[PDB]
């Protein structure tokens, strides 16, 4: 039952092909209605790059840019696209980029995994999971 994954196959630019439950996970995060339904109308490209241990995930909408960098495993502060201020940590575990965010008791996860050349992106907050499929541009 052999598998292997490596951080660098997630490198490249990723077009959103698909989405299930996004608007709800965002409601769970406390995303205001305007940014919630507007965010869903945006078809953003996820752009991932890495320099060894150091990773950068960029999110581009036509009208915004949010971006973070980090050495994997080290806690770092994050300005999420919706204004949340989290203490984030990124690891590569079980063949996936894992982004754990913590903010005021509450917390969330975003896992990014290469699967058949597609990047599968599942977000989880307090039992509200979303999945979004990006294709390689
Ligand atoms: K690992």
Residue numbers in the entry: -3 to 133
Study text:
Fatty acid-binding proteins (FABPs) are involved in the uptake, metabolism and intracellular trafficking of fatty acids. Based on epidemiological studies and animal knockout models, the isoforms FABP4 and FABP5 were identified as potential diabetes and atherosclerosis targets. The aim of this study was to develop a dual FABP4/5 inhibitor and, to this end, high-throughput and fragment screens were conducted with X-ray crystallography as a follow-up method on those ligands that showed appreciable affinity and favorable physicochemical properties. Structure-based drug design (SBDD) based on initial hits from high-throughput and fragment screens yielded 216 ligand-bound structures of human FABP3, FABP4 and FABP5 isoforms, many of which were at resolutions of better than 1.2 Å.
